[PDB]
Structure 1
């Protein structure tokens, strides 16, 4: 199937019509997405098949055809861009200054942008275009607004 680097929609024909359940990143021959998008199931890319290679429910991440390749990190200071790919809508870059998720095991960057559930797996980028994490796993704060973590994996 298509192995070109870039952002991709994760679609399903199991439900009514064709539904977008998420988004992912193709880089160095590996497809990267959030675990809750695919639940670890196999993926199709045209006539080709993508098999899961690594996954973790707690990190909420999964890679296909090879190990996690994305290792860029938010510098904790500058604005970033969410390359949002919403269901049935064109890819669109949104600039924001990330907030902070303070946890017992350290701080994580967070993006306060609200999109449909099927936008999960959309990449967050630095000024150099490097993917610093995926959008789609977060929390719903007091005023009902959505704040996602900047979820990044580990390159072995």
Structure 2
């Protein structure tokens, strides 16, 4: 709605040992390209996820911070970083539309969550420091960095952030999806889709990427591409 007021509502913390549920590996599915960075199945519909966290009791204020054991101790930079849900939260309206991963000192999320619009946390207006529409992702704090590349050969692990629910640690075996251009690499699986912005971890308990470049294919078989840390601190490298 507001498309200028998106609150971070924490779903979980980034550490793959939730439920290790076996799945993955599905027939190479056809998918129709749209706006260069997006796809759908010919003419596909869309729905809000909806989320509850982020109370209206001083929901704007200025910045009360989401990382408080005691009342705000003048720290001004405390971050309960992890697997977040991106809800579009107007200061008088709450509607979840995607997800995002904040870890270390960088928040990497997705552009199609609304309009690549500004985030917020206790009314602190978290405005992007990077946004790439072509891959259709966003970075805050600099570029997308964390140092976490999924190694293609093994299973990809996804903290599938179930809508308004607990995460699901799923062992997904990789797959492909063919456009009019050609076949692309992803997790193509017939199963319930998570929120676009769920963390992609590798089976070693390391990696921290992002799931959401695709749609519900066939009639609900979620196909989305496997994104990983490609950028840097900002001007400085990944680490060295």
Q: Give the superposed CA RMSD.
A: 2.8
**Map of 1:22-61 to 2, 5 A cutoff?**
22-61=98-137
- Unmatched runs of 5 consecutive residues or more in structure 2: 1-64, 67-78, 233-240
**Map of 1:2-151 to 2, 5 A cutoff?**
2=66, 3-14=79-90, 18-101=94-177, 108-112=185-189, 113-115=191-193, 119-131=195-207, 133-142=209-218, 145-151=221-227
Matches of 1:6 and 1:27, distance apart in 2: 6
Moved >6 Å (runs of 4+) = 102-106
Deviations 1:62-120 (A, max 9, x none): 0123221144222221112210112211122111111134786985332424326xx11
Deviation at 1:49, TM superposition (A): 2.4
- Unmatched runs of 5 consecutive residues or more in structure 1: none
Give the number of the structure whose residues are more often helix, by fraction. 1
TM-score, normalized by length of structure 1?
0.80
Taking a change above 3 Å as real, the CA distance of residues 98 and 41 of structure 1, as seen in their structure-2 partners, is same
Give the number of the structure whose residues are more often strand, by fraction. 1
Q: Which gives a bigger RCO, structure 1 or 2 (Cα 8 Å, sep 6+)?
A: 2
Q: How many residues align?
A: 154
Q: Is the 8 A contact 1:70 1:154 kept in 2?
A: no
Matches of 2:104 and 2:153, distance apart in 1: 28
